[PDB]
Chains A and B, each alone.
Chain A
Amino acid sequence: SLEIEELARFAVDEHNKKENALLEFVRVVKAKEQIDLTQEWVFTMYYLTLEAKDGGKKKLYEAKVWVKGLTNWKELQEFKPV
Chain B
Amino acid sequence: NNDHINLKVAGQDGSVVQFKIKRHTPLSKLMKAYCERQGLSMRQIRFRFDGQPINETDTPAQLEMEDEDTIDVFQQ
Q: How far is the CA of A34 from the CA of B7 in the complex (A)?
A: 9
Q: Are B20 and A38 in contact (CB under 8 A)?
A: yes
Q: Which residues of A contact B22 (CB under 8 A)?
A: 37-38
Q: Total interface residues on A, using CB and 8 Å? A: 12
Residue on A nearest B30 in the bound complex, by CB: A37
- Contact residues of A between 29 and 65, Cβ < 8 Å to B: 32-38, 42
Report A-chain residues with C-beta under 8 Å of the C-beta of B36.
70, 72-73
B28-45 CB mask vs A (1 if < 8 Å, else 0) is 011001001101000000
Please, which residues of chain A bring their CB within 8 A of the CB of B29? 37
What is the total number of residues of chain B having a CB less than 8 Å from a CB of chain A?
Answer: 15
The answer on a CB contact under 8 Å between B39 and A72 is yes
From A34, A70, A72, give the contact of B6 (CB < 8 A). A34
Q: Which residues of A contact B25 (CB under 8 A)?
A: 37-38
Contact with A along B1-13 (1 / 0, CB 8 A): 0001010000000
Please give the residue numbers on chain B whose beta carbons come within 8 Å of chain A beta carbons, in ascending order: 4, 6, 17-22, 25, 29-30, 33, 36-37, 39
A residues near B (Cβ < 8 Å) are: 32-38, 42, 70-73
| Nearest 8 pairs of A and B residues by beta carbon | A37-B21, A34-B18, A36-B20, A35-B19, A70-B37, A38-B22, A37-B29, A38-B4
A-B contact sample (15 more), CB < 8 A, given A33-B17, A37-B21, A37-B33: A34-B18, A34-B19, A34-B20, A35-B18, A35-B19, A35-B33, A37-B19, A37-B29, A38-B4, A38-B20, A38-B25, A70-B36, A70-B37, A71-B37, A72-B37
